[PDB]
């Protein structure tokens, strides 16, 4: 895994029509991985590769990376909120949150088999609750099921 | 003075669509994370985040399940993203050098 740098010229010709994104670090990133359950939730085999891959990727993209592993619903809520409230956000230009677990439409599972609603997660980082990120790009990546229906795929005509 | 909506300037990438399962290889990890890392590391230098998520969508659409003797054999998945972004989001990696 290697991240090709942007050229000075590409920066010069794109910065005026883009979010400001030049702080060092670019932002804080949070990688929250749930792999071991028990509370119908199978061990997330290979979940360890996802976590390591994202940690490396976000570091190479110039983020300061925070990691959390195997957390209950309530722990995720409290720690997401702690993260959102960190003082660094005022001096960074963006934020990244990646959530990797089992889930259902609109919510993800803690290792205790209880659910954290994604609406509540986004709310932690909104304009009213996270003023230090107002007008700054906030990226969320959610690796989790949104239902139990397998997509069998369809033939192409 | 200009005020803000309660929520804006977010982009959320989802591994799968509403009602459906996201797929994960027991050795190689999640299709969506694997694709995301390959595209971002290759294209963050010259492509904005929303456009990179479109490239991720292309990779996911093309993939199919390998899990012989089970309901996941040849299965499919589609990723998506939802955006309240108000500008291009370039990560400008390694700038300044």
């Amino acid at each position: 895994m290697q991240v090709k740098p942007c050229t000075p010229e590409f920066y010069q010709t794109h910065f005026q029509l883009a979010y400001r994104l030049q702080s060092r670090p670019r932002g804080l990133a949070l990688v929250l991985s749930n792999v071991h359950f028990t509370g119908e939730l199978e061990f997330r085999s290979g979940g360890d590769v996802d976590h390591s891959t994202l940690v490396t990727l976000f570091k190479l993209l110039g983020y300061d990376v925070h990691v959390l592993c195997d957390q209950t619903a309530q722990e995720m809520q409290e720690k997401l909120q702690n993260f959102a409230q960190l003082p660094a956000h005022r001096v960074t230009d963006s934020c990244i949150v990646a959530l990797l677990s089992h889930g259902v439409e609109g919510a993800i599972y803690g290792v205790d088999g209880k659910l954290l609603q994604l609406q509540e997660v986004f709310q932690l980082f909104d304009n009213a609750n996270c003023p230090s990120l107002q007008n700054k790009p906030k990226m969320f990546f959610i690796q989790a099921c949104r239902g139990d229906e397998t997509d069998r795929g369809v033939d192409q005509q | 003075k200009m005020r803000l909506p309660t929520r804006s300037d977010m982009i959320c990438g989802y591994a799968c669509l509403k009602g459906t399962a996201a797929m994960r290889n027991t050795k190689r990890g999640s299709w969506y994370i694997e694709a995301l890392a390959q595209v971002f590391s290759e294209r963050a230098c010259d492509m904005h985040v929303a456009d990179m998520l479109v490239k991720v969508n292309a990779l996911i659409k093309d993939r199919e399940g390998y899990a012989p003797g089970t309901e996941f054999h040849r299965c499919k998945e589609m990723s998506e993203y939802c955006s309240t972004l108000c500008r291009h989001l370039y990560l400008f990696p390694g700038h300044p050098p």
């Binding site: 099921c145 | 996201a22 089970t70």
Partner: peptide, 5 residues
């Protein structure tokens, strides 16, 4: 092998 999240 491929499995569901």
């Amino acid at each position: 092998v491929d499995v569901a999240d």
